[PDB]
Amino acid sequence: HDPLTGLPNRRYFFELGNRYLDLAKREGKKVFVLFVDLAGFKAINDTYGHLSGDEVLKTVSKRILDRVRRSDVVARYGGDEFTILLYDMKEEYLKSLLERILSTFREPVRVENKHLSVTPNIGVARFPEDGENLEELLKVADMRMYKAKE
Numbered sequence: 409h410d411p412l413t414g415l416p417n418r419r420y421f422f423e424l425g426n427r428y429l430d431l432a433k434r435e436g437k438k439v440f441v442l443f444v445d446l447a448g449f450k451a452i453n454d455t456y457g458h459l460s461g462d463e464v465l466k467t468v469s470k471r472i473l474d475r476v477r478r479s480d481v482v483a484r485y486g487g488d489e490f491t492i493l494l495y496d497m498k499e500e501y502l503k504s505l506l507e508r509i510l511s512t513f514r515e516p517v518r519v520e521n522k523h524l525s526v527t528p529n530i531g532v533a534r535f536p537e538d539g540e541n542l543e544e545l546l547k548v549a550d551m552r553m554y555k556a557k558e
C-alpha cells in the first residue's frame with residue numbers, strides 16, 4: 409500500500425481491479441473506471457513546501473475513501489493522480505457519482521489556518537464498452553480527461 413495515503417498503489421489497483429472485471433464479466437455487470445487528476449499541487453509545493461502538499465493529499469485521500477463504497481477501489485495512481493473503480497454502476501447514476509466525487513476533492517484542506525484547495529479533473533471509462541482489461545480502460549479514462557481540458 410501507498411505509504412503516504414495508506415491507499416492501494418498502481419500495482420494493487422491492477423491486481424484487485426482485474427479480478428473485479430472478471431467478476432463483472434461473469435455477473436453481467438458494468439464497472440466504471442474514473443481517472444482523477446488534481447491540479448494545484450505545484451503551487452502548494454512551491455509556496456508551502458512538499459510536506460504541506462503531502463498533508464493535502466492525505467486529507468483528500470481520507471475524504472474520498474469515506475464517500476465511496478468499501479467494496480469500490482480507490483488507489484493513488486501517481487503523485488497527484490487517483491483512480492476509482494466503481495463496481496456495478498449504470499450510466500443513469502453517473503452524474504450523481506461525479507458530483508459527489510468532485511465536491512469531495514474540491515473541499516479545502518486547512519493546513520495551519522491556510523485554506524489549501526486542489527482542482528479535480530475526471531475522465532471516465534466503462535467496462536465492457538471501452539475495453540477488456542483495466543490497462544485499456546485506464547488509458548481511455550486518462551485520454552478523456554486530457555481531451556476535455558484542451
Ligand SMILES: Nc1nc2c(ncn2[C@@H]2O[C@@H]3COP(=O)(O)O[C@H]4[C@@H](O)[C@H](n5cnc6c(=O)[nH]c(N)nc65)O[C@@H]4COP(=O)(O)O[C@H]3[C@H]2O)c(=O)[nH]1
Nearest residue numbers: 475476477479480493494495496497498500501502504505
Ligand atoms: N459501486 C457504487 N455504486 C454506487 C455508489 N453510489 C451509488 N451507486 C449506485 O447508484 C445507484 C443510485 O444511487 P443513489 O441515487 O445515491 O441512490 C441510493 C441512495 O439514496 C441510497 N443509498 C444506498 N446506499 C447508501 C449509502 O451507503 N449511503 C447513503 N448515504 N445512501 C445510500 O439508496 C439509493 C439506492 O441505492 P442502490 O440501489 O444501491 O443504487 C445505487 C447504486 O447502484 C457507490 O458509491 N459505489
Ligand SMILES: Nc1nc2c(ncn2[C@@H]2O[C@@H]3COP(=O)(O)O[C@H]4[C@@H](O)[C@H](n5cnc6c(=O)[nH]c(N)nc65)O[C@@H]4COP(=O)(O)O[C@H]3[C@H]2O)c(=O)[nH]1
Nearest residue numbers: 471472473474475476477478479480501504505508509512
Ligand atoms: N448517495 C450515496 N452514497 C453512497 C452510496 N453508497 C455509498 N455511498 C457513500 O459511501 C460511503 C461509504 O459506503 P460504504 O462503505 O458502503 O459504508 C456504508 C454502508 O456499510 C452502510 N450503509 C449506509 N446506507 C446503506 C444502505 O442504504 N445499504 C446498505 N447495504 N448499507 C448502507 O453504512 C456505511 C456508511 O454509510 P454512509 O455514512 O452513508 O457513507 C457512504 C456514503 O457517503 C450510495 O448508493 N448513494
